[PDB]
Design a protein around this ligand. Structure first.
Ligand SMILES: Nc1nc2c(ncn2[C@@H]2O[C@@H]3COP(=O)(O)O[C@H]4[C@@H](O)[C@H](n5cnc6c(=O)[nH]c(N)nc65)O[C@@H]4COP(=O)(O)O[C@H]3[C@H]2O)c(=O)[nH]1
Length: 247
């Protein structure tokens, strides 16, 4: 045990150089969103001859404090693809994950600003999501971070929102551009009752501030209609379109 990790933590620190990392994307179709090109970005690793999923190493990168490094790698990689798909005339928008330790990371704030500029990519195309739980904690930083990146026109949103009470509490203290609905509420509206009304106490509340909304993980047409009645701007999940490397 003392060993396997040592091989992982090394190979990772390599993909952080001349990499081995790569990104798969997932279509984010919109109903109320009417209608832009958007994909959530997902990190893949080229260990040996096959492709690794963050379920194979994110744990490691955690204890060794390499997430900041990686997630800066992810964002910079997204901003590149944005330059590429834009120099090609596509105005593709990318949803990218940012951990909590990045709210204070300047190299992040600097890697966003510089790249975003060097590719002629207007920040508006870069959407950054992160759990509300991680925000309810690393707040102060996640506070100024918002401002830092938001100034460049980027969009900062919450992932897994609506779970616990304080969910609506953070709103009056934070201020996201988009809300990725928490699965504990999403996956069940076809039957679930309180949830039916739930994504309304949320939807109808976003419309005012203009806070977009994304119900992800959708896995059936039945619930697909449900979110339209709700007024959920965007939908994501294997049922709409799985994740893939292609664009
Ligand atoms: N969020 C989301 N996922 C969907 C959906 N439909 C299918 N999935 C799949 O289910 C998995 C779980 O994603 P997760 O909860 O964010 O949990 C993720 C995440 O914690 C981590 N991860 C993967 N890529 C990245 C990345 O680029 N940045 C960061 N910070 N973490 C990543 O690895 C876990 C597994 O990722 P994957 O192998 O890519 O596998 C993903 C994804 O391919 C959907 O609508 N929404």
């Amino acid at each position: 045990e003392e060993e396997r990790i040592e091989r992982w933590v090394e190979q990772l620190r390599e993909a952080l150089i001349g990499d081995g990392f790569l990104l798969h994307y997932q279509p984010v179709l919109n109903l109320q969103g009417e209608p832009l090109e958007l994909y959530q970005a997902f990190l893949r690793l080229e260990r040996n001859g096959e492709m690794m999923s963050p379920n194979a190493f994110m744990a490691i990168a955690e204890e060794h404090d390499l997430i900041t490094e990686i997630d800066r790698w992810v964002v910079a990689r997204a901003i590149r693809q944005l330059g590429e798909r834009q120099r090609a005339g596509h105005k593709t928008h990318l949803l990218v994950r940012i951990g909590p330790n990045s709210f204070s990371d300047p190299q992040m704030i600097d890697t966003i600003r510089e790249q975003l500029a060097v590719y002629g990519v207007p920040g508006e195309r870069l959407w950054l999501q992160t759990p509300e739980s991680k925000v309810f904690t690393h707040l102060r930083n996640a506070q100024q971070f918002l401002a830092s990146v938001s100034a460049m026109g980027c969009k900062v949103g919450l992932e897994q929102f609506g779970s616990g009470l304080d969910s609506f509490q953070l709103l009056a203290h934070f201020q996201p551009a988009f809300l990725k609905l928490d699965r504990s509420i999403t996956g069940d509206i076809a039957s679930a009752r309180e949830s039916q009304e739930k994504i309304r106490e949320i939807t109808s509340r976003a419309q005012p501030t203009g806070i977009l909304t994304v119900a992800e993980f959708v896995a059936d047409a039945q619930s697909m209609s449900s979110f339209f009645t709700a007024g959920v701007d965007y939908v994501q999940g294997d049922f709409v379109a799985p994740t893939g490397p292609l664009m």
